[PDB]
Ligand binder design. Structure first.
Ligand SMILES: [Ca+2]
Length: 579
DNA sequence: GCGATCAGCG
DNA sequence: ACGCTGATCGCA
């Protein structure tokens, strides 16, 4: 019901200098995954290609790698990375319908061409799920069904570029797509394909020593509990703590007794068992997620892990990392932080270089709210978290422990993002009127932040959305809901999203500037990971001293704010040592 | 499949 | 009753 050529060979009219291209990878994880078909729509017509012929044709391969041949795509990072696993470079992507839909409305959840197309009343294409099936029924259909689905996606992309571009322009989002999100997409592709090298012997050795500490703590719990149980069974664990040992019930869940770490810490005066249960969970988390979980996804021949950075998922414009998540590798507890010793450079006498922004979101907040005292504090490079710990625990800067600082950190962001006196008292273990008086005092010193929090909520009520400094957008229909709880959650989104989102815009700008600068200095250094406000690279040890001057400066100059941006940096033999 | 939980980011 | 995530696991 749509006309196209089922092509055998590649012809010159398939290689026009502007086209919609579909390079279909059905597997969710596209690393080293099969390419099942190719479709091209251009001025000359519509074409389906079998990949075993087009990807071995030198004229088609050259066309893919020629940046003057412009391609409109959906999810071009997926195609680019699977092509790299075929030894093929894709260049010239001038429109990515996934990123365009994500900028226009991140809450759509647009996961395929049909879902983006529906945004513009275009419906002559089917959902990917209806063509391939789901779960155990997933299959590549017969070639004519596949060829028509891929051509319909390409024709949809061909039609939808212009209406998407013109709405992006009306939102002031068109330079965000073309100068930020599309260039970042190619940089993520390289990072994911390069991967990160893992010391599997060291990981395996820690997993052995963990399995032995786990058993010990486990017997000390059973003995403290009188009997044995499934320490992972909330039914059983709840029965032990709040019936057998008769500990107080401080919190319930929708299913029963709460056993979260916040509760278990408040019960430590009552019984020694709760601190052993905490230690047990922590050692079990390291074992399942970060030992077994990481060994499960290492590619054995190279000892590399290849994450996928989802660029069109978070409601704020942050990235996320999946399979493995390399953005939540432990760091705070000493036992967990040693996991970072297994992350090593991919070549001998290379090193890991990490740089990160200091207090990025409070600096963004200072700039956006134009708070006099908050701006002045950062013009003095004050460490607000340490300063806040001193104020809370009535100590000196000498006696600010890392746990007090991390505590003050949660208070600093909590207050500006709408923490209540109740919530503050539960976090500090102070009375509820002391928490409220503290909150009033903090807004006495930063009235401009208070004003911004009110202004941004009223602006979200009247506009229907909030924006970031580079014009990312988030719609907030619930901001006018009549239900008090639903409306309150939306108000705190209006306070938080412009700040977190602007901080995501800034570090994405830095990654793009950094790559251009690495290239102009002809350095071998390349990005491996982004962790929200941190960039991790690897480079020959001979480039470290240049990177100590280049990277901080690039990051600090990514944008110009009314306060300076501050960047800390370390390097060494493993990720562990690069802090 | 989902909720509770916990690892990270602010 | 601060916000944004992803992984594991039990299942109330
Ligand atoms: Ca930081």
């Amino acid at each position: 019901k749509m006309a196209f050529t089922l092509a055998d060979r590649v012809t010159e009219e398939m290689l026009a200098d502007k086209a919609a291209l579909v390079v279909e990878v059905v597997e969710e994880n596209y690393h080293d995954a099969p390419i099942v078909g190719i479709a091209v729509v251009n001025e000359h017509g519509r074409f389906f290609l079998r990949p075993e012929t087009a990807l071995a044709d030198p004229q088609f391969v050259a066309w893919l790698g020629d940046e003057t041949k412009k391609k409109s795509m959906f999810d071009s990072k997926r195609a680019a990375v699977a092509l790299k696993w075929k030894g093929i470079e894709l260049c010239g992507v001038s429109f990515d319908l996934l990123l365009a839909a994500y900028l226009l409305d991140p809450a759509q959840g647009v996961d395929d061409v049909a879902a983006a197309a529906k945004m513009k009343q275009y419906e002559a294409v089917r959902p990917d799920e209806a063509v391939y099936g789901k779960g155990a029924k997933r299959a590549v259909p017969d070639e004519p069904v596949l060829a028509e689905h891929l051509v319909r996606k390409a024709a949809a992309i061909w039609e939808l570029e212009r209406p998407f571009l013109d709405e992006l322009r009306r939102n002031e989002q068109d330079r965000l797509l073309v100068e930020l999100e599309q260039p970042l997409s190619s940089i993520l592709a390289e990072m994911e394909f390069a991967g990160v090298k893992v010391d599997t012997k060291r990981l395996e050795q820690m997993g052995k020593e963990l399995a032995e500490q786990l058993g010990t703590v486990e017997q000390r719990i059973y003995e403290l509990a009188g009997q044995e149980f499934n320490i992972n069974s909330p039914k059983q664990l709840g029965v032990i703590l709040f019936e057998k040992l008769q500990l107080p019930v401080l919190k319930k869940t929708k299913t029963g007794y709460s056993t979260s770490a916040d509760v278990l810490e408040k019960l430590a005066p009552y019984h020694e068992i709760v601190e052993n249960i905490l230690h047990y969970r922590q050692l079990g988390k390291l074992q399942s997620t970060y030992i077994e979980g990481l060994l499960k996804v290492v590619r054995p021949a190279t000892k590399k892990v290849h994450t996928i950075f989802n660029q069109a998922l978070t409601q704020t414009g942050r990235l996320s990392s999946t399979e493995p998540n390399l953005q939540n590798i432990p760091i705070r507890l000493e036992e967990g932080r040693k996991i970072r010793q297994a992350f090593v450079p991919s070549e001998s006498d290379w090193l890991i270089f990490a740089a990160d922004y200091s207090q990025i979101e409070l600096r963004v907040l200072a700039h956006i709210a134009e708070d006099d005292n908050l701006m002045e504090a950062f013009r003095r490079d004050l460490d607000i978290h340490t300063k806040t710990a001193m104020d809370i625990f009535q100590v000196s800067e000498d006696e600010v422990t890392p746990n007090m600082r991390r505590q003050a950190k949660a208070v600093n962001y909590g207050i500006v993002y709408g923490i209540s006196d109740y919530g503050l008292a539960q976090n500090l273990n102070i009375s509820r009127k002391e928490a409220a008086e503290f909150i009033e005092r903090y807004f006495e010193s930063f009235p401009g932040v208070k004003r911004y929090m009110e202004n941004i909520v009223q602006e979200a009520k009247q506009k229907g959305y909030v924006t970031t400094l580079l014009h990312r957008r988030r719609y907030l229909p619930d901001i006018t809901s009549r239900n008090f709880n639903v409306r309150s959650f939306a108000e705190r989104m209006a306070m938080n999203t412009p700040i977190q989102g602007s901080a995501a815009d800034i570090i994405k700008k830095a990654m793009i500037d950094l790559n251009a600068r690495l290239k102009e200095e002809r350095l071998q250094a390349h990005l491996l990971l982004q962790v929200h406000d941190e960039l991790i690279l690897e480079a020959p040890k001979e480039e470290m001293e240049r990177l100590c001057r280049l990277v901080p400066e690039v990051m600090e100059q990514a944008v110009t704010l009314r306060v300076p941006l501050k960047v800390d940096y370390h390097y060494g033999s493993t990720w562990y040592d690069a802090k």
